[PDB]
Amino acid sequence: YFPYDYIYPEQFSYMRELKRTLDAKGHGVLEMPSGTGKTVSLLALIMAYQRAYPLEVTKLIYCSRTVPEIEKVIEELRKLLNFYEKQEGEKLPFLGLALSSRKNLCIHPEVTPLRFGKDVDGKCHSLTASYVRAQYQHDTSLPHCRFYEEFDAHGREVPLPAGIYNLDDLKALGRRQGWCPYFLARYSILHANVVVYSYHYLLDPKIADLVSKELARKAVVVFDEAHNIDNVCIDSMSVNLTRRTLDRCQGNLETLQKTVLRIKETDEQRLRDEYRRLVEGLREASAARETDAHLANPVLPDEVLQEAVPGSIRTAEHFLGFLRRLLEYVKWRLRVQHVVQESPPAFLSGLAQRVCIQRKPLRFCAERLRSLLHTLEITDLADFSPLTLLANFATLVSTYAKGFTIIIEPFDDRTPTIANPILHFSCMDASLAIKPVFERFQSVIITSGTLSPLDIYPKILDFHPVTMATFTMTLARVCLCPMIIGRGNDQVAISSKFETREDIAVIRNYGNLLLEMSAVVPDGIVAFFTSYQYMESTVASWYEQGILENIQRNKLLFIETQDGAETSVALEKYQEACENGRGAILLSVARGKVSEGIDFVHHYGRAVIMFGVPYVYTQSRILKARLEYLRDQFQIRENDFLTFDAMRHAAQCVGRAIRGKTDYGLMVFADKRFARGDKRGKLPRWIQEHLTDANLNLTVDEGVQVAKYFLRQMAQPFHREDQLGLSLLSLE
Amino acid sequence: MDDQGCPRCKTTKYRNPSLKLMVNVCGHTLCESCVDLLFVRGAGNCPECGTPLRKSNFRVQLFEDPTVDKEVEIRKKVLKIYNKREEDFPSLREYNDFLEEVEEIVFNLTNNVDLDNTKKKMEIYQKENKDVIQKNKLKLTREQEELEEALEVER
Ligand code: SF4
Ligand SMILES: [Zn+2]
Ligand SMILES: [Zn+2]
């Protein structure tokens, strides 16, 4: 038993769900809204299992979606370790591995404070296993990467580290006795009772290593916030190419020609000596760490990538074969970007007719390009990163162009103009990135609160026998207060799904309701719009009538920008004003950058405003191809897929202001489209406990009076309310 | 563009960026200006050696296809007599070891190697084989059967 939070009851329902998974042995779906303790109650049942002496093989890899939430999972798992470590008396060891790669890497001051992740890790690996593997020992070239050599020493040895560590625990241990996040991460993957990281590593058929053994029906995988999986399984394996990246790929390719040209006959013989070893060999020592950086296993739903380096017989012969893959690609890409065209067999069959080669050297050219510089290795990833984007695009053609498509949007179509052309090559059936995950492990359990419409869940085409919702029995319903404002028989103008600045009735209603809510909300207000086009037209219209000027009198304005550099500095100013002075207001987009995972609470933003249904632009041809393929599997579900993606992002912007129970958040759906759809693909605990009362056909005048009930009754819960259990589960 | 040279007129690339360039059989690049200028003066002779040009064997293009002279010759030698070898070898081989010789013999053929006379003796060896074209005829017949079958489903 884990004495901490009051008993609803809730752990009794989560205990039965974890028992049928091991018996049925399949994927399970569990609804865990943000209003219920999905961390204290979950981690209390998970360590009872870590002590499963009977259960022969028991694992957990647990993920999340943001780098702060990793740390959140850590700390919460810390304390439940604390208490029944105290309670059960004699403590058995533990490990939870927050495995953060790039952005949490290097302790050398020369390397660390350059801003990006990938390029600087290329400088790191170029130093470690490109200059100090080639120049294998020296005095200046072979840089003081001294604790990699300390890893060499204690990787020969056997330590036993203590427990689950933070991200900064491993940097502080970097200073003291913990070594490299990567390499200690390797030694601790060798035995780890719990590794916590992001699910983007597993759901990416490229550099995914599965960090598992050869067992295909063992281990336990637990996902977190896996509601938005339809796009991750497609955007991960998606590849693209622009004229700017293609121009740099051709410029850096000429530098490689001058490297081989200046090689005489003595050094040239050493390059051909390793070519024979790679053919007769198959377990090369370079497959331990350099595989994770370069394209590891692009054919994840198939087998591993290991061939007898085809398409090469000499060193200079491989350069001409790769040069034809660049001089012909620039001639085929520029000729198809003149007009619009969408045909998967146009690029697959067109490339084979021009370049008269086989599908074997074009498939393995990505791995051979990395091994080409391993022999000379005097290079570095800064000059190799533009060459990787071209080799990654060719890999998705020899064994993936038989089920994908090519979208060409050159002349003004959600893409840059003629100054920077771009082509699209994504997927449709979001199941190729999750099928190897279900086959490599035993059972995978996803935990999402906003994922409530389960009728559209078979989009992934995967079985799910474990299905259960969550109601959370609560005495006082002052936790949340969903409200729907849609004017009605007074103006009926509140929706704008295909209108820009043609009318001023809907824009005026959005400013009149927001101005009144800015004086009654006790803290901050976190509003969201539809897209970037309708958001800029609404703010610009308030400058003429004089609506945004009155908002500046009370709260401070915060609008999401476009660049990622000015976005991080804008959120820090919002968190400082809401905690020190008066809570400000957020005017962003439902799919912007403050909607992925901010975890803002009461002292940051306890009010949620939704301006219309957050739909998507289906007129674009980058999304129509993803929906056209659904008609081959589901004909009648051509419209329900758009409703799911619209209500999922709407609940995601709502399921963030509250985390425990005493947060008391407020959400507003100021749109008339929320009429009958609020009783189907919505939260089951909102229909019976909130949406039962008549509060859907409200207007601007009525929406303020209803909002006063949540802002006035909230002052009563102050001393004690729903306190059941008495730290003993009520003897249940 | 202007670094590869120009035969007769020599003053054409500096007059129009979108110039229509053509190729031949021996391995040269002549624009559309040198085609009409040489016909009114002579005929179809190579400006360097002696290659006759009788039939309309010119590939007109304005996208500047022959960028590098090394990569344009290896694409024509394979789709001539080496493309037909993609079927005879699999009928006797058993492992991926002889396919490296085909990729290697076409790389050195451009760099002036005496082994060019060796491959010419195999073309004159046997005079009865045909094939290749007979294989493409079966693929076209099966394609028309699928279109007719797909049309019946629509009906
Ligand atoms: S290995 Fe550990 S130390 Fe050496 S570069 Fe990468 S981080 Fe910096
Ligand atoms: Zn000319
Ligand atoms: Zn000639």
Would you write up a description of this structure?
The structure is cut from a larger assembly and holds chains A (732 residues) and B (155 residues). In chain A, strand 13, helix 21 and strand 14 form a beta-alpha-beta unit. Chain A is built from 26 helices and 16 strands. In chain A, helix 2 (40-50) packs across helix 3 (67-87). The longest helix of chain A has 21 residues, at 67-87. The radius of gyration of chain A is 28 Å and the shape is globular. Chain A has a domain at 480-715: Rossmann fold, CATH 3.40.50. Helices cover 41% and strands 9% of the residues of chain A. With 732 residues, chain A is α/β, with parallel strands linked by helices. Chain B has 155 residues and is mainly α. Chain B is built from 6 helices and 2 strands, in the order E-E-H-H-H-H-H-H. Chain B has a two-stranded antiparallel ribbon. In chain B, a hairpin with a 5-residue loop joins strand 1 and strand 2. Chain B starts with 20 loop residues before the first strand and ends with a helix. At the A-B interface, helix 12 and helix 13 of A face helix 2 and helix 4 of B. The structure holds iron/sulfur cluster (SF4) and zinc ion (2 copies). The site of one zinc ion (ZN) has 5 residues of chain B, from loops.
Summarize the structure.
Chain A: Its main location: nucleus. The structure is cut from a larger assembly and holds chains A (732 residues) and B (155 residues). With 732 residues, chain A is an alpha/beta fold.
Descriptive labels:
part of a larger assembly, 2 chains, A: 732 residues, alpha/beta, Rossmann fold, seven-stranded parallel sheet, six-stranded parallel sheet, 41% helix, B: 155 residues, mainly alpha, two-stranded antiparallel ribbon, 6 helices, 4% strand, extended
